[PDB]
């Protein structure tokens, strides 16, 4: 974004999908543990069962489990 290697708007929308899924990746990994801190004793494993699908997504997208190396320089991986 600094040296202006023009990122297409389609790849930009792909990155938007990424970012708005990471919003979920944060919402779960807070609320679940937040439920396990506030007093909600049972739903701990519940939110992990919900999150299981994001694991398959991050795996099949670019990387092993955290989707590592989904951002190259001239676009994405």
């Amino acid at each position: 974004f600094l040296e202006n290697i023009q990122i297409p708007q389609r790849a930009s929308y792909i990155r938007v999908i990424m970012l708005e899924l990471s919003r979920i990746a944060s919402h779960l990994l807070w609320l679940g543990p937040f439920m396990a801190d506030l007093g909600a004793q049972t739903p701990f494993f519940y939110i992990f069962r919900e999150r299981e699908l994001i694991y398959d997504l991050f795996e099949a997208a670019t990387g092993m489990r955290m989707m590592h190396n989904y951002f190259r320089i001239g676009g994405v991986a």
Binding site: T42, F45, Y46, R49
Partner: protein, 50 residues
């Protein structure tokens, strides 16, 4: 004669039923911990202590 005590040496008490209660309560402790570790962590989870 009856110098100190004829029938009162040690033969008036039996410790069988007390030990049966001990065995029963220990077995029931096993049952209840099995109940816990197999129902609490298995409502929406995997099986307990397999």
């Amino acid at each position: 004669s009856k110098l100190e005590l004829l029938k009162e040496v040690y033969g008036l008490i039996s410790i069988l039923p007390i030990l049966t209660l001990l065995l029963g309560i220990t077995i029931e402790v096993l049952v209840i911990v099995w109940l816990e570790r197999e129902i609490s962590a298995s409502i929406q989870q995997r099986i307990g202590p397999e």
